[PDB]
């Protein structure tokens, strides 16, 4: 589980993203669709072209949800509940895909935060996102 230092590293790094979080969400998804094309199977109704506005729009919905997880770092299972229902009952997304989203998020967080992406923080993020992904996947059956 997230240790104090983990929550500390996570808040510092997320805080530097600040305003740019919406554009990171989109760079994130974009990296995902390009490197792991199977993920697209879930977005056949979106336009997945470089720059698509449906992709930026969604990018922001995703970052906004990571921000609110940081904000409630100590109560994530109840803070992300709705999202946990949506992905399990309506969208029905295979859990392996979440580890690919997370990996592209680190790549994204790493290409914009050279000063801040140390080993320890890299270890605190990986843990955060895995913990985000577990909650979101928690009600599959």
């Amino acid at each position: 589980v997230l240790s104090p230092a983990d929550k500390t590293n996570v808040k510092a790094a997320w805080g530097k993203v600040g305003a740019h979080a919406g554009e990171y969400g989109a760079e994130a998804l974009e990296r995902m669709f390009l490197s792991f094309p199977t993920t697209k199977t879930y977005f056949p109704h979106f336009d997945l072209s470089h720059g698509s506005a449906q992709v930026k729009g969604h990018g922001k919905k995703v970052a906004d949800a990571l921000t609110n997880a940081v904000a409630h770092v100590d109560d994530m299972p109840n803070a992300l509940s709705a999202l946990s229902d949506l992905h399990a009952h309506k969208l029905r997304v295979d859990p392996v895909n979440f580890k690919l989203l997370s990996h592209c998020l680190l790549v994204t967080l790493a290409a914009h935060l050279p000063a801040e992406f140390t080993p320890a923080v890299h270890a605190s993020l990986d843990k955060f996102l895995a913990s985000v992904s577990t909650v979101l996947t928690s009600k599959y059956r």
Binding site: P37, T38, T41, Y42, P44, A88, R92, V93, D94, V96, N97, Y140, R141
Partner: protein, 146 residues
């Protein structure tokens, strides 16, 4: 498909004895009940809320046979699963939008079912061979994604 002439044989000899109607239906049935997120692709099949429902649904029973039938053609094309499945890959990717990861779930359920029908005969060595076989098949069903 690095299959040994002994593996190639093991598979082959045991399929011969398979009742395709029953197995196919059961694989699909179990697939939908154990990992219920697959129900997403089949909303037009009707009541798929409980195992007894999923297992009793005749559209499921019928699609199952078709699936196994395409599995059967594959065993007869073990050295080119890709060509044998190209067109199926596209359909599943381009028209149906199915995540290939389900393919693996199907192969694994598929293997469970077989050990349920043949008991003692479905030995570790036999399983081992089939595990390569279903994995060659999922990878071929997902070979033309883009």
């Amino acid at each position: 498909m690095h299959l040994t002439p002994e593996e190639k044989s093991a598979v082959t000899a045991l399929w011969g004895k398979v009742n395709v109607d029953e197995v196919g239906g059961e694989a699909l049935g179990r697939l939908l009940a154990v990992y219920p997120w697959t129900q997403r692709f089949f909303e037009s099949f009707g009541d798929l809320s409980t195992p007894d429902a999923v297992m009793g649904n005749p559209k499921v029973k019928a699609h199952g046979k078709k699936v196994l039938g395409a599995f059967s053609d594959g065993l007869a094309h073990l050295d080119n699963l890709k060509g044998t499945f190209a067109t199926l890959s596209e359909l599943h990717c381009d028209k149906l939008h199915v995540d290939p990861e389900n393919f693996r779930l199907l192969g694994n359920v598929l293997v469970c079912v077989l050990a349920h029908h043949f008991g003692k005969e479905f030995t570790p060595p036999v399983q081992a061979a089939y595990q390569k076989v279903v994995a060659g098949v999922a990878n071929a069903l997902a070979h033309k994604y883009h």
